[PDB]
Structures are given as C-alpha cells and as structure tokens.
C-alpha cells in the first residue's frame with residue numbers, strides 16, 4: 026500500500042485506481058516514458074474503464090513531449106484514442122484547475138518549470154503544463170530520476186503529488202486490473 030519515503034508520497038496501483046475511479050474529471054499527460062514502454066494501448070484501455078465509470082477524460086500534449094514533434098499524438102492515434110479527446114497545451118493548460126486528477130504517465134520535463142532554463146534544449150522558454158492546478162497529480166515513472174533536461178522536479182514534493190513507481194506499461198496495466 027501507499028507509504029511516505031523522503032520528501033515524497035509513494036502510492037500504489039490501487040491508490041491510483043481508487044482516486045481516478047472516483048474522480049469526476051481526469052487529464053492524462055503522456056511523455057517520453059510512455060514511448061519507451063509503449064504503454065499507449067494500456068493507457069487507452071484505462072481511459073475506457075474510467076469513461077465507462079462516467080469519468081471525464083482528456084489528454085494534454087506538450088509541444089516537445091517525447092523525442093520528436095507530435096510524438097505523443099501518433100502514439101495515441103495508434104492506440105485508437107479518440108482524436109477529439111487529445112488537446113495541445115495552449116488549449117487545455119487552463120483546464121487543469123478544473124481537473125480532479127492529472128495522470129502524468131512517463132512525463133517529467135514538460136511539467137517542470139526548471140526544465141526550460143537551458144538554451145540548448147528543445148523546451149527552452151516554452152510554456153509548461155500546470156498539472157499542479159489539478160486536485161491530485163499522479164506521476165508514473167520508474168524512480169525519482171530526472172528527465173532529458175537533467176534537472177530536479179519540485180512537483181514530486183508538493184502536497185497534492187503522488188508518485189507511482191514502476192514501468193509505464195506495467196503500472197498502467199496493474200491500475201487497469203485494480204479498477205475492474
């Protein structure tokens with residue numbers, strides 16, 4: 026079950042399931058990690074279970090999420106994710122405040138303000154996804170390791186942030202199992 030370690034909260038697949046299954050609105054934020062693990066299909070399945078529970082689901086895509094422009098968009102289309110449920114940062118970033126949960130799967134730098142300080146990086150000076158504005162922020166990643174930018178993400182310490190350590194595909198599959 027869930028336990029606190031260091032300055033962060035480490036939740037479990039069941040915690041994630043319980044929280045999202047009982048939320049009214051969830052915003053999914055995919056990143057590099059989802060591509061490494063090819064978790065898009067499991068992710069779309071999870072969204073299906075949630076929508077079946079009456080939960081409102083949508084996806085927020087950062088301009089440089091992943092490792093090529095439009096990387097997340099093609100992976101989501103691949104998983105048969107409804108095109109209308111996918112939004113670019115500029116048109117969904119203001120919606121995080123009205124969201125109960127921000128499901129960040131395999132993303133880091135695109136939610137980190139400290140990531141766009143390097144002029145040699147693709148994300149330099151770009152806006153960031155305000156996942157904090159949501160009731161709860163769930164991060165799926167294998168550890169507390171940094172992203173491409175190589176900088177710490179302080180969101181991992183916020184009060185409304187729960188870390189779900191594990192492979193993006195494996196963890197998402199466990200969440201799906203715990204849900205139905």
Ligand SMILES: NC(=O)c1ccc[n+]([C@@H]2O[C@H](COP(=O)([O-])OP(=O)(O)OC[C@H]3O[C@@H](n4cnc5c(N)ncnc54)[C@H](OP(=O)(O)O)[C@@H]3O)[C@@H](O)[C@H]2O)c1
Pocket residue numbers: 055056057058059061062088089090091092093094096131132133134135136140146147148149165166167168169170171172173174191192193194
């Ligand atoms: N999109 C482009 O065109 C492009 C091109 C070149 C560079 N970039 C740069 O790449 C970055 C993109 O950011 P982002 O949030 O998408 O990615 P990111 O910050 O580079 O990384 C996201 C996270 O995925 C986790 N991860 C890795 N393998 C995983 C797995 N198998 N399962 C679950 N999690 C896994 C990582 O941590 P763990 O080790 O903890 O799992 C990592 O912190 C930005 O800094 C951007 O500027 C973008």
